[PDB]
């Protein structure tokens, strides 16, 4: 077995360099984690949600790691400290558990977001307050099992020992690294899916715009005016007869629908009405110049208006139409707010008016705050990936070839990044998370 002092390498000023960085970063990391752990339990709206149970569990795994790692790293390297032979297997095992639990905490946070975005109405039933804690425990137990194995019956006896960590073999590290790479593969595969489903909800085009405003329905419905309609506002007949509307439906689809149409039929019939709306605007002397100046987003906002009150109606908004052509967005936004169209349908008008001033689909963005929560995580996962890649790579190199004191020195400075990662992560939540930033004004006082 190799000696304990052989793993202590400090070429003069690098001993006081770890002493100034590791002690400052480790105390500052435990300062932010405690400001997050209490914050989740302090606010009534944050404690109930399962997403914040994984944010809290990360801060819990980070707080304990920030104190256990910074204590034992400065102790062993800077002050040449050796507590006991059994206590060391406890120190290392405690660091191994707290940092593995940070990874696992984020995997559950990534799984939480996958279910939320992939299956949104079935999320609240697929993931409950209890189920999240059951998943937390399972993750914490498997964290402790893989982390304390050396402490238990695993140690390097006839098998070669690791040149980075004392008393631990190459075979156990290989096992933990492969286990951690399995947790990372889980994170990468689950989050790649999270970004794909988040793009689906932020995706906008006119069909998805008017789907919100007009209201999609594959069954025959009645519009505000009282006439029979189908899909995205496709008025069938003004007539009070449903059988007349049912006949009009079979006429417009070319099949015996019996009151129900398919989604791609509603999309077919929609683009049929959009093409017809566009032609109407073009064959309108007052509307065409306005349409000519508007972009792919603002053009859709005008078609939205033509869908609502027809070409002859929209053409009447001469005051606003002049501003839309002159690109005076803010002046048109306030002028349109002074219309009867805003006084009759404020809900829809505000959104339409916004698309005219911003030039963005943000006004029609579904699940925006739940989607921005997935964005927060992405950055947290990026930092995690950045900081941990050099540390794990040196541990992988350790098992394949023999490494000299020059590599051993470099590993100690990479180990400092885990501490930086755990310090940076609660700052990301303190800046992006809107629910945390909104609670930051009330909870602290
Ligand atoms: C943060 C981490 C990268 C976690 C790796 C988990 C172990 C893998 C398994 N299974 C890590 C890196 C370290 O360099 C060390 C760590 C933990 O723990 C203490 C107790 C502070 C050690 C003190 C003695 C040093 C000997 O050179 C190694 C120090």
UniProtKB/Swiss-Prot annotation:
Tissues expressed in: Preferentially expressed in cells of the immune system with higher expression in B-cells and NK cells (at protein level). Expressed in skin in suprabasal layers and hair follicles (at protein level). Highly expressed in tonsil and to a lower extent in spleen, peripheral blood mononuclear cells, and thymus. PubMed:14657172 could not detect expression in normal brain. Expressed in brain by perivascular microglial cells and dorsal root ganglion sensory neurons (at protein level).
Record GO cellular component, one term: perikaryon
Residues exposed to the Cytoplasmic side: 42-53, 112-131, 197-376
Reported impact of residue 94 to G: Affects cannabinoid agonist binding
Lipid bilayer topology: Multi-pass membrane protein
Biological process annotations from GO: adenylate cyclase-activating G protein-coupled receptor signaling pathway; G protein-coupled receptor signaling pathway, coupled to cyclic nucleotide second messenger; immune response; inflammatory response; leukocyte chemotaxis; negative regulation of action potential; negative regulation of mast cell activation; negative regulation of synaptic transmission, GABAergic
Extracellular side: 75-86, 155-170, 398-409
Transmembrane regions listed in the UniProt entry: 16-41, 54-74, 87-111, 132-154, 171-196, 377-397, 410-431
Effect of substituting residue 113 to A: No effect on ligand binding. Alters agonist-induced inhibitory effect on adenylate cyclase
Up-regulation conditions: In macrophages, down-regulated by endocannabinoid anandamide/AEA.
GO molecular-function term, one example from the UniProt record: cannabinoid receptor activity
Compartments it resides in: Cell membrane; Cell projection, Dendrite; Perikaryon
Function field: Heterotrimeric G protein-coupled receptor for endocannabinoid 2-arachidonoylglycerol mediating inhibition of adenylate cyclase. May function in inflammatory response, nociceptive transmission and bone homeostasis.
Protein name per its UniProtKB record: Cannabinoid receptor 2
Name of the encoding gene: CNR2
């Amino acid at each position: 077995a190799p000696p304990m002092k052989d793993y202590m390498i400090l070429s003069g000023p690098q001993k006081t360099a770890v002493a100034v960085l590791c002690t400052l970063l480790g105390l500052l990391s435990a300062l932010e984690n405690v400001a997050v752990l209490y914050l989740i339990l302090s606010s009534h709206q944050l404690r109930r949600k399962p997403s914040y149970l994984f944010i809290g569990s990360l801060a819990l795994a980070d707080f304990l790691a920030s104190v256990v790692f910074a204590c034992s790293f400065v102790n062993f390297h800077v002050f040449h400290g050796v507590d006991s032979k059994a206590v060391f297997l406890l120190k290392i095992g405690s660091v191994t558990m707290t940092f593995t639990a940070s990874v696992g905490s984020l995997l559950l946070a990534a799984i939480d977001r996958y279910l939320c975005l992939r299956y949104p109405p079935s999320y609240k039933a697929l993931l409950t307050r209890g189920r999240a804690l059951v998943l937390l425990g399972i993750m914490w137990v498997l964290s402790a099992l893989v982390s304390y194995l050396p402490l238990m019956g695993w140690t390097c006896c006839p098998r070669p020992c690791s040149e980075l960590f004392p008393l631990i073999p190459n075979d156990y590290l290989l096992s933990w690294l492969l286990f951690i790479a399995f947790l990372f593969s889980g994170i990468i595969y689950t989050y790649a899916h999270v970004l794909w489903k988040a793009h689906q909800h932020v995706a906008s085009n006119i069909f998805e715009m008017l789907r919100i405003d007009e209201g999609l329905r594959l069954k025959i419905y009645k519009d505000t005016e009282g006439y029979y309609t189908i899909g995205i506002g496709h008025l069938l007949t003004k007539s009070p007869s449903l059988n007349a509307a049912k006949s009009e439906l079979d006429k417009a689809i070319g099949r015996n629908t019996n009151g129900v149409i398919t989604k791609d039929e509603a999309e077919k019939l929609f683009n049929q009405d959009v093409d017809a709306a566009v032609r109407g605007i073009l064959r309108n002397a007052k509307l065409k110049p306005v349409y000519d100046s508007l972009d792919a987003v603002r053009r859709a906002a005008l078609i939205n208006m033509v869908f609502q009150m027809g070409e002859t109606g929209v053409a009447g908004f001469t005051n606003s139409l002049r501003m839309l052509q002159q690109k005076r967005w803010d002046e048109a936004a306030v002028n349109l707010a002074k219309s009867r169209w805003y006084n009759q349908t404020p809900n829809r008008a505000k959104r339409v008016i916004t698309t005219f001033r911003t030039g963005t689909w943000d006004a029609y963005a579904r699940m925006r705050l739940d989607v921005e929560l997935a964005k927060t995580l992405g950055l947290v996962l990026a930092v995690l990936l950045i900081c941990w890649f050099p540390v794990l790579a040196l541990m992988a190199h350790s098992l394949a070839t023999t490494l000299s004191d020059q590599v051993k020195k470099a590993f100690a400075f990479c180990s400092m990044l885990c501490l930086i990662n755990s310090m940076v992560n609660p700052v990301i939540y303190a800046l992006r998370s809107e629910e945390i930033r909104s609670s930051a004004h009330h909870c602290l006082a």
